[PDB]
Each structure stands twice: as structure tokens, then as C-alpha cells.
Subunit: 135 residues, 4 copies
Amino acid sequence: GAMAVEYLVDASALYALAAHYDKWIKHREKLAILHLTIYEAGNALWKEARLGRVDWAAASRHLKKVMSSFKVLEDPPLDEVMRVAVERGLTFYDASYAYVAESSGLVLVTQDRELLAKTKGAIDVETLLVRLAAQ
Amino acid sequence: AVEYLVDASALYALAAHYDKWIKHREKLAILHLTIYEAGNALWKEARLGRVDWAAASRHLKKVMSSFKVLEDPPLDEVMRVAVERGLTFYDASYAYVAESSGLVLVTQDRELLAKTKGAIDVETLLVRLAAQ
Amino acid sequence: AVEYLVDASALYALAAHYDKWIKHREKLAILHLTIYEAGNALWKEARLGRVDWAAASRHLKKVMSSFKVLEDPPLDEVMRVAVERGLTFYDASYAYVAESSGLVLVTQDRELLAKTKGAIDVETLLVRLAAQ
Amino acid sequence: AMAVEYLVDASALYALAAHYDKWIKHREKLAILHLTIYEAGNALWKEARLGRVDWAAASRHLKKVMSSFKVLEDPPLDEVMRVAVERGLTFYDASYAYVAESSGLVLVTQDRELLAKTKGAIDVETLLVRLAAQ
Ligand SMILES: [Cl-]
Ligand SMILES: [Cl-]
């Protein structure tokens, strides 16, 4: 099954990437998220709306479009993630990206400074953009 | 054919009565969100200490696999429900999928129970199954 | 005397207009909770990569030192506002204190604005303070 | 410079709240942060959201229970912020760590993480076996 995926993108990244749309499409199919990402992204945008943002209705549509651009990966075993979480001092959510990223031999793209540090191979969104700009 | 959608709060209460419902597993479903919510919940208890997170997680893993997993909802639609009914995005997800899929949402959350067409709590579900 | 109770969301949008309100500072107040709520918000910024955090936190410290801090609400009363008006405990805190104290809640939360008698947003508070 | 020896956080407040008789005699030694009121409040609220027949009576017992704890002043956002960024703690947790460590108090927490990252911190069982020896 087409496994042209190279990066696992979390919500903090997904959010930043949504801004540089043009820059990364075409390069998608190389980008992936977890099922959890969708909800995290959704909740973030909901918070925006809560604190006032006449958008939301329109912003939600945009997110929906960006989201569909990504490939969604199989959920990790609650089993294994729990371990990473416990061992690396991460939350279950973060330990989820850290676990998939590694077990899948993928580069985790994240904005969270602690995840970048506790995940082998992680890079941030600015790095992803320069990488993609190259090829 | 799936009849109920079980959220994280219910999944938890249900994991305490495995035997009373495994025989009805085909009737229960969850959202991919549920795995994470359930997981993060078990993580907090591990955080607040109690030697067994590994064992406990093993058990949660077992209970989890029993449910069919529905498709993620359109972030679009969920968002409308979240705003229109005063729910979080997560809670909204369940209300949306539950209603939109024509299913009975099983939740322990009084708020979701009140704002979702047909929701019932875990005790209600167990008596329904005991009759089915 | 205090006229408004400002929450974390409002507090943030205010820091950028320090000049426009310090004259009315003793007319403004926050809850003890606010200090922690704002700090955590500033922490997530650092968490998501923000070089300042140290500097930013020092500015946030000064802005906060400008408000009066009211006594903590009775856990008793807040629970009731929270359950009844479907609000988190933290949000209900501001709702309760503002109302029971006869103050104007200044929040950016659309949900809070709608469930707190007489609450206004930061834009409004600013035009009022200007008229003052 | 007070009789306060321990800073009790929310997780602790809860554990303790069911051993009331076993420590109320030492109430003067125990303290909390203003944050604690809200954190404990929010916790109880969650039990209520998830169906807890008596959120009312319960919130009332929690009210009384907490009135016996002295309440220390809020830490300078200043210092907490640094403890957090540095120790991998949230602003909330870092607050206890800072107050406790700074005011030379013994932080009583049920959080394994905070215990680990807070100098001389202990759990409820420890506080209870200690108060007993007093
Ligand atoms: Cl953490
Ligand atoms: Cl809510």
C-alpha cells in the first residue's frame, strides 16, 4: 500500500503548516498524521472560536481541506505507547506521535520543544519547509 | 450491525463489567478518539501512582480491541455541533457521529447525555443488553 | 473601588494596551486563579518554541502586579454555577465572583460572555475606560 | 517563619480528605496554594459531570475540609516560569515545586512526577505516617 510517507505530522505542526499551504502540497503523500491529530487540530480551532473569532465556520472548512490532504496512519497499541509515555516522561498524546514516528521509521515534525528533544529524528516545521523546498 | 457508540467515560465504566457485555461486543463501537482518551485517562492514574500501569494498560488494550471503530467525523460538522450546543470539540464528535450515524450514544457525561438525541448512560446500556 | 473582574483571556489581550488602562488599574481586578491560568498560557508558548518566555514572563509579571486580587469564591457556590450553567469550574469561578460581587466580567470567552450577566469583552472595556 | 511544615497540593488534598480525623489535629502544619482551591474544585466538578449523585453535599464537605488549611501567597509568575521550563513541569505543578522548595516546606503530592522533580517531596502515606509519629 503506497507508503511514500516520510513524516509524521502532529497538531502543533499541522497548524503551522496550514499557513504555508502551497509550500507543501505535491509533497503530501509524504506527510502523515494520526487519527488523534484531527481531533487535536479541531479542538485548537474550537478554542480560537470560543475566545472570539468570527471565523470558525470558515476556518473550520479550511482546516477540513488541509486535513484531507494528509495520510492517516493506523492507531498505535495502547500497550506500547503507555510505555513510551511512562518512560520518556510524555503524555499519552505526545507518546503517541513519538511511538508511531519511531516504530514506523518516520520523521516526526512537531513544534513542541519537549517532543523534538525526546523523539529521535524529530524536526520542526521550519525545517520541514526547507527540506521540501529542496526536492 | 453496530447499535451503540461508547465514549471514553463509558468505556471506562464498562471495562469494569467485561463479562456482562463481551457477548454483545458486535453491537458496540467507538471513535479513534476513544483509544486516546481512554489511554490518556489510564496515563493519569499511572501519573498519580499505582504499580500496574503496564498490567492495567494490557487490560485496557484487551477491552479496547472488543469494539468496532467508526470513521472520523467531518471536522466541519462536529465544529457546528460544538458551537451550537455548547460542547467541546471532543464531546461534539460523539454527539455528531452518534446522531448522524443513527446510533445510541453511551456516555457517563451528564452534559453529553443531555445534549445528544437518545444518549443513555452505562447502567441503562447494561440493562438493555441483559434483555437483548 | 473595583468595577471589573478580568479573566485570563482578557488579561492577555490587555497586556498589549498597558498604556490605555493603568490609569484605571484599581478599577480592575482578577482572581488568584488568573495568575496561574496566565502563567500556564505563557508556558505553552515556551513549550511550542518561544525564545523570550523569560523576558515575556517578566513583562506578564508586571502587567499582573497591576490588578487587585479578590478573595477566592466558596468552592460551594461555584460548583453550583458550573453544574447549572454548564461551565468548567474555573469559568464558573469568574462567573460567580463577577455576579455575586456586582462587577462586570471582562472576558474574551464567547461562552462566558453569554452565561454571565453583564459580561463584556476587551474591546468594550477599552472604549469604556476611554470614556472614563 | 510559621508552623506550616507541609505544602499540600490537589492530588494530596483528595487522598487526605478521607483521613480527616488522622490529620485535622495537625491542620496548623498543613498549607495549600490558592491554586489548590480551584484544582480541587475542578476535580470534584469532573466527578459531578460524570454523574455523582451528591456533587452538592460533596462540594460542601470539600469546602469544610479545605477551610482547615492555611493558604500561602501566590508565587512570582517570574520564578515559577523558570522552574517549569527547566524541570519539564506545567506552570501549575512548577508552582508547588517552587513555593515548597523556596519556603523550605515539604511538598505533599500524590504525583510521581512532582515527587521526583521536587526536593524532599513526599506522598500522602508518608505525611500520614509522619504526623502519626507526632
Ligand atoms: Cl509534561
Ligand atoms: Cl464545557
